Scaffold this active site. Structure first.
Site, PDB file in Angstrom:
ATOM      1  N   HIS A  47      63.410  54.869  52.202  1.00  0.00           N
ATOM      2  CA  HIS A  47      63.985  54.202  53.364  1.00  0.00           C
ATOM      3  C   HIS A  47      64.939  53.085  52.927  1.00  0.00           C
ATOM      4  CE1 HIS A  47      61.581  55.934  56.850  1.00  0.00           C
ATOM      5  NE2 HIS A  47      61.074  56.533  55.785  1.00  0.00           N
ATOM      6  N   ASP A  48      64.703  52.509  51.749  1.00  0.00           N
ATOM      7  CA  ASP A  48      65.652  51.521  51.229  1.00  0.00           C
ATOM      8  C   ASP A  48      66.900  52.209  50.701  1.00  0.00           C
ATOM      9  OD1 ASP A  48      66.804  49.124  50.499  1.00  0.00           O
ATOM     10  OD2 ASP A  48      65.887  49.108  48.499  1.00  0.00           O
ATOM     11  N   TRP A 164      63.111  68.929  46.035  1.00  0.00           N
ATOM     12  CA  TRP A 164      62.441  68.253  44.924  1.00  0.00           C
ATOM     13  C   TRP A 164      61.904  66.878  45.321  1.00  0.00           C
ATOM     14  CZ3 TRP A 164      67.182  69.433  41.297  1.00  0.00           C
ATOM     15  CH2 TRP A 164      67.233  70.820  41.064  1.00  0.00           C
ATOM     16  N   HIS A 169      55.856  64.383  49.658  1.00  0.00           N
ATOM     17  CA  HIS A 169      54.946  64.687  50.769  1.00  0.00           C
ATOM     18  C   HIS A 169      53.626  65.300  50.313  1.00  0.00           C
ATOM     19  CE1 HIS A 169      57.948  64.408  54.367  1.00  0.00           C
ATOM     20  NE2 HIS A 169      57.952  63.341  53.593  1.00  0.00           N
ATOM     21  N   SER A 170      53.499  65.534  49.015  1.00  0.00           N
ATOM     22  CA  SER A 170      52.218  65.953  48.458  1.00  0.00           C
ATOM     23  C   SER A 170      51.230  64.792  48.414  1.00  0.00           C
ATOM     24  CB  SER A 170      52.397  66.520  47.053  1.00  0.00           C
ATOM     25  OG  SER A 170      51.163  67.029  46.576  1.00  0.00           O
ATOM     26  N   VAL A 177      53.963  59.567  63.766  1.00  0.00           N
ATOM     27  CA  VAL A 177      54.280  60.870  64.347  1.00  0.00           C
ATOM     28  C   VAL A 177      53.348  61.133  65.521  1.00  0.00           C
ATOM     29  CG1 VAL A 177      54.477  63.354  63.980  1.00  0.00           C
ATOM     30  CG2 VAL A 177      55.177  61.767  62.196  1.00  0.00           C
ATOM     31  N   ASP A 187      49.540  67.405  53.221  1.00  0.00           N
ATOM     32  CA  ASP A 187      48.833  68.470  52.513  1.00  0.00           C
ATOM     33  C   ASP A 187      47.363  68.121  52.348  1.00  0.00           C
ATOM     34  OD1 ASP A 187      48.363  67.075  50.021  1.00  0.00           O
ATOM     35  OD2 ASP A 187      49.695  68.345  48.870  1.00  0.00           O
ATOM     36  N   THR A 189      45.633  67.612  49.848  1.00  0.00           N
ATOM     37  CA  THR A 189      45.327  66.729  48.719  1.00  0.00           C
ATOM     38  C   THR A 189      46.245  65.498  48.663  1.00  0.00           C
ATOM     39  OG1 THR A 189      46.714  68.136  47.292  1.00  0.00           O
ATOM     40  CG2 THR A 189      44.318  68.559  47.297  1.00  0.00           C
ATOM     41  N   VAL A 192      46.448  63.685  45.447  1.00  0.00           N
ATOM     42  CA  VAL A 192      46.830  64.425  44.254  1.00  0.00           C
ATOM     43  C   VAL A 192      48.268  64.904  44.393  1.00  0.00           C
ATOM     44  CG1 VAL A 192      46.291  66.375  42.717  1.00  0.00           C
ATOM     45  CG2 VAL A 192      44.441  65.196  43.933  1.00  0.00           C
ATOM     46  N   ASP A 194      50.571  67.369  43.736  1.00  0.00           N
ATOM     47  CA  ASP A 194      50.433  68.770  43.346  1.00  0.00           C
ATOM     48  C   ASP A 194      51.238  69.686  44.275  1.00  0.00           C
ATOM     49  OD1 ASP A 194      49.022  68.655  45.694  1.00  0.00           O
ATOM     50  OD2 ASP A 194      47.043  68.969  44.795  1.00  0.00           O
TER      51      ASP A 194
HETATM   52  C1  HEM Z   1      64.393  64.336  53.914  1.00  0.00           C
HETATM   53  C2  HEM Z   1      63.933  63.990  55.123  1.00  0.00           C
HETATM   54  C3  HEM Z   1      62.553  63.310  55.344  1.00  0.00           C
HETATM   55  C4  HEM Z   1      61.966  63.207  56.540  1.00  0.00           C
HETATM   56  C5  HEM Z   1      62.529  63.764  57.864  1.00  0.00           C
HETATM   57  C6  HEM Z   1      60.704  62.513  56.378  1.00  0.00           C
HETATM   58  C7  HEM Z   1      59.799  62.231  57.375  1.00  0.00           C
HETATM   59  C8  HEM Z   1      58.605  61.547  57.213  1.00  0.00           C
HETATM   60  C9  HEM Z   1      57.704  61.115  58.266  1.00  0.00           C
HETATM   61  C10 HEM Z   1      57.901  61.334  59.781  1.00  0.00           C
HETATM   62  C11 HEM Z   1      56.666  60.497  57.696  1.00  0.00           C
HETATM   63  C12 HEM Z   1      55.459  59.871  58.431  1.00  0.00           C
HETATM   64  C13 HEM Z   1      55.823  58.472  58.956  1.00  0.00           C
HETATM   65  C14 HEM Z   1      54.688  58.035  59.839  1.00  0.00           C
HETATM   66  O1  HEM Z   1      54.610  58.516  61.006  1.00  0.00           O
HETATM   67  O2  HEM Z   1      53.847  57.221  59.366  1.00  0.00           O
HETATM   68  C15 HEM Z   1      56.861  60.512  56.259  1.00  0.00           C
HETATM   69  C16 HEM Z   1      56.000  59.975  55.323  1.00  0.00           C
HETATM   70  C17 HEM Z   1      56.229  59.816  53.970  1.00  0.00           C
HETATM   71  N1  HEM Z   1      57.430  60.065  53.305  1.00  0.00           N
HETATM   72 FE1  HEM Z   1      58.870  61.351  54.090  1.00  0.00          FE
HETATM   73  N2  HEM Z   1      60.562  62.199  55.037  1.00  0.00           N
HETATM   74  C18 HEM Z   1      61.685  62.664  54.373  1.00  0.00           C
HETATM   75  C19 HEM Z   1      61.912  62.515  53.023  1.00  0.00           C
HETATM   76  C20 HEM Z   1      61.176  61.759  52.132  1.00  0.00           C
HETATM   77  C21 HEM Z   1      61.591  61.418  50.786  1.00  0.00           C
HETATM   78  C22 HEM Z   1      62.938  61.828  50.153  1.00  0.00           C
HETATM   79  C23 HEM Z   1      60.629  60.684  50.209  1.00  0.00           C
HETATM   80  C24 HEM Z   1      60.728  60.142  48.754  1.00  0.00           C
HETATM   81  C25 HEM Z   1      60.007  59.111  48.305  1.00  0.00           C
HETATM   82  C26 HEM Z   1      59.541  60.549  51.174  1.00  0.00           C
HETATM   83  C27 HEM Z   1      58.331  59.909  51.008  1.00  0.00           C
HETATM   84  C28 HEM Z   1      57.311  59.798  51.932  1.00  0.00           C
HETATM   85  C29 HEM Z   1      55.957  59.346  51.660  1.00  0.00           C
HETATM   86  C30 HEM Z   1      55.308  58.943  50.312  1.00  0.00           C
HETATM   87  C31 HEM Z   1      55.243  59.361  53.013  1.00  0.00           C
HETATM   88  C32 HEM Z   1      53.772  58.973  53.283  1.00  0.00           C
HETATM   89  C33 HEM Z   1      53.668  57.563  53.838  1.00  0.00           C
HETATM   90  C34 HEM Z   1      52.211  57.177  53.936  1.00  0.00           C
HETATM   91  O3  HEM Z   1      51.334  57.983  53.526  1.00  0.00           O
HETATM   92  O4  HEM Z   1      51.916  56.064  54.433  1.00  0.00           O
HETATM   93  N3  HEM Z   1      59.917  61.217  52.332  1.00  0.00           N
HETATM   94  N4  HEM Z   1      58.059  61.156  56.002  1.00  0.00           N
HETATM   95 CA   LIG Z   2      48.868  66.845  47.377  1.00  0.00          CA
HETATM   96 CA   LIG Z   3      68.934  49.658  51.351  1.00  0.00          CA
END
Ligand code: HEM
Ligand SMILES: [Ca+2]
Ligand SMILES: [Ca+2]
EC number: 1.11.1.16
Length: 329
Positions: A47-48, A164, A169-170, A177, A187, A189, A192, A194
């Protein structure tokens, strides 16, 4: 170069990172665990950084989401990001590191806590943020594949690179949401790093995990698991489906591609040649636990074959009846 206790680092400048490492492991990551704050910190790196466009503006990986938090955390696409920004601010103020550096450092350190995780390269020296990111630069889970791929491409990422990066999201769960049921992972896990995320998104959907289908949500194959509509579509789109499927049971590729593309993302708006390589500071992650599998109660018939060049690999299912995914602690 060496640090105070004789540990080798490629540049003496990197020595300042060790006390920061110790502090965040203890006081942000709950004792170097792969838990909620690790996941939120990984999410923050994106997000940054994604606030970057050659024509639309934004300084990319510049710490703007912290330095201009009242502006950025209020963008619709940044819903829920306020909590991790708020948790990280005291560390930035306390340490002698820029907000842009801290965000990426916390993310790389967090990932190194996760079994199956990978060491992400880290560069030190991002200047303080100059300006808030423009709105409308962060992809949302209800955006079309073309919209998402165009936005990521504008930022400099190919569709394969989007796949990649989505290895993230693993180790991921959602609070916004579906606000009624916070903490349902993407997922089975979430602790993990994975291939389960790539496997499970390719399964035929079965249910909506809450009491409502929400905006940006697709059918999930598992109770207690949530599936984003963007992930559902990217798994199956011709631009991305073969890349998506190739991640399945391919731990080395997941790690290698995630590290390379994360490094590239951490440098958005930056010039690596003006920075200092401090990659050697990041700890070695614990080894993978578990193995690639279809969830219990599933068979290869449950797979939606989207890749035309190659069939889905012949994974075996975990034993027993279909079970739900427990919420993340
Ligand atoms: C490419 C389009 C992407 C979309 C549309 C998207 C969408 C989302 C959404 C809706 C959530 C849940 C937010 C919530 O309701 O709490 C989420 C969580 C997350 N996103 Fe993605 N995402 C994208 C790409 C990425 C990328 C590139 C990363 C790279 C670091 C990333 C890392 C994460 C992580 C680690 C979570 C989990 C947050 C938590 O467990 O608190 N996402 N994403
Ligand atoms: Ca996993
Ligand atoms: Ca920024």
């Amino acid at each position: 170069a060496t640090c105070d206790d004789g540990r080798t680092t490629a540049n003496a400048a990197c020595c300042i990172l060790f006390p920061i490492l110790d502090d965040i492991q203890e006081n942000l990551f709950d004792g170097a665990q792969c838990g909620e704050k690790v996941r939120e910190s990984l999410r923050l790196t994106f997000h940054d950084a994604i606030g970057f466009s050659p024509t639309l503006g934004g300084g990319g990986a510049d710490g703007s989401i912290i330095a201009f938090d009242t502006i950025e955390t209020n963008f619709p696409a940044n819903a829920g990001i306020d909590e991790i920004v708020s948790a990280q601010k005291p560390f930035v103020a306390k340490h002698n590191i820029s907000a842009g550096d801290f965000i990426q450092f916390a993310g790389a350190v967090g990932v190194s806590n996760c079994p199956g995780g990978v060491r992400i390269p880290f560069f030190l020296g991002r200047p303080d943020a100059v300006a808030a990111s423009p709105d409308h630069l962060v992809p949302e889970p209800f955006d079309s594949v073309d919209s998402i791929l165009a936005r990521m491409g504008d930022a400099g990422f190919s569709p394969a690179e989007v796949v990649w990066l989505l290895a993230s999201h693993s180790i991921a769960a959602a609070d916004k949401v579906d606000p009624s049921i916070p903490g349902m992972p993407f997922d089975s896990t979430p602790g993990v790093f994975d291939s389960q995320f790539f496997i499970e998104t390719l399964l035929k959907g079965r249910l909506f995990p809450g009491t409502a289908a929400n905006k940006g949500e697709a059918q999930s194959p598992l109770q207690g698991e949530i599936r984003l509509q963007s992930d559902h579509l990217l798994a199956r789109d011709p631009q991305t489906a073969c890349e998506w499927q190739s991640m399945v049971n391919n731990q080395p590729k997941i790690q290698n591609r995630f590290a390379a593309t994360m490094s590239k993302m951490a440098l958005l708006g930056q010039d690596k040649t003006k920075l200092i390589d401090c990659s050697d500071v990041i700890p070695t992650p614990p080894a993978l636990v578990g193995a690639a599998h279809l969830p219990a109660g599933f068979s290869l018939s449950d797979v939606e074959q989207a890749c035309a060049a190659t069939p889905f690999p012949a994974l075996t299912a975990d034993p027993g009846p279909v079970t739900s995914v427990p919420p993340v602690p």
